[PDB]
Structure 1
């Protein structure tokens, strides 16, 4: 939960903190039922901790140490998936989570990870292979499909259906940047007047009297 909220929280040394947290929780990754729930929970936490996490040991040696630390976490996850290879579903959930742990670990750490990751690609388990290949897919197109037309689409009588529906459902907190997003976008395509004509019309329409107009 803390990692989900990480976008809200403040960190002096976030990367080091998350690194040290994976290091600690990975020790737990090993009554039998509860220890297996601990494995699941630990791995779900580790999947959250690994999500855009560059690794950091405690310069050229630092990249090699980072690679050695990658190899430790990665090998431990591999062992856990080999051990996997209601009792059945818990094991499959642990396996799926483990695969996502590898995935996230790779997605951040590309320079340390790719060589060992090919070793995942060989691995006897087809489900893990497939998921790992989708991870590779993320890296390789990372380093047009960006259709904003749907936002600037105008219906008959100039409805702007997407923006008007987006205007009445987005929380009031993000209203301050929604105006920034729509104004810059429509102005970039010479449709600024269409956006203003639609939004201004809705205000006067619902305004009770002339003194309520655009006040507040």
Structure 2
């Protein structure tokens, strides 16, 4: 029977290769999205593995539009109503597959970047993604899902020049607010925090902080408030780091860069809360600020 699976993955890859010639193609892609969570006994395991390969690594770049949209619609049905999510194991497996799919699809970075950009608003897709993952819970598989999402965010920040969003700064700001809740088995927990730090660092790169639109006291007051919140959280993290030594050293090294970016963006609303640790007791903080 393994021969049958051999030609089956062969034809699946062939079709994924020549979809660029091109509708029946949409039906083909919907069958793939159905077969990602194909949980049939004795084959489905390797089936989904092969799927995770093929559409991961060999999908035609001009077929890049349709896939994104279809996934969006699927996770649009993941939310039961009004931002609330419904948790099923099938949805969980969908999420776990989907993360690796965009990870590989982004990281290949072959020719044909234009076919990636002109159509893709992956903004809402990731927003729904992190909103489902945040409510997953706290356990081993959940931690693994969370950290994989963190590398995905790191990658798609690394490729920010190619892609396109409707509102980039608002999207990144919402991503920062969602991610920094995750900062604080333990070995994993520390790994989650470790990956989340370069995720937040990549997000903060040149980000003017935008307050969430309420009525607000004013723009400047709420910008100061967000600056104070993020700065205090980072200082608490670095104080815990100040006391596996290589892990803590890397954690310090990236938290330093987080301070550097977050101060370099909002200098106006930002010196006034952190010019008073130029006299700080710990010389590590003082040195760090002292080149920032």
Query: Under a length normalisation based on structure 1, what TM-score does the superposition of the two structures give?
Result: 0.59
Equivalent positions of 1:1-216 (< 5 A) are: 1-58=155-212, 61-85=218-242, 87-135=244-292
Q: Aligned residue pairs: how many?
A: 134
1:105 deviates by 0.3
Moved more, 63-72 or 119-128: 119-128
**Match of 1:55, SS?**
coil
SS of structure 2 residue aligned to 1:122? coil
Query: 1:125 offset after TM fit, Å?
Result: 3.1
| CA displacement 1:4-55 (0-9 Å, x = unmatched) | 1111111211111111111111100111111111111111111111111000
The Cα shift of 1:60 comes to 7.0
What is the Cα deviation at residue 89 of structure 1? 0.7
Q: Which runs of 5+ in 2 are unaligned?
A: 1-154
| Secondary structure of 2:205's aligned partner | coil
Name the CA distance, whole Å, in 2 between partners of 1:3 and 1:56. Answer: 18
The structural deviation recorded for 1:70 is: 0.6
Gaps of 5+ in 1: 136-216
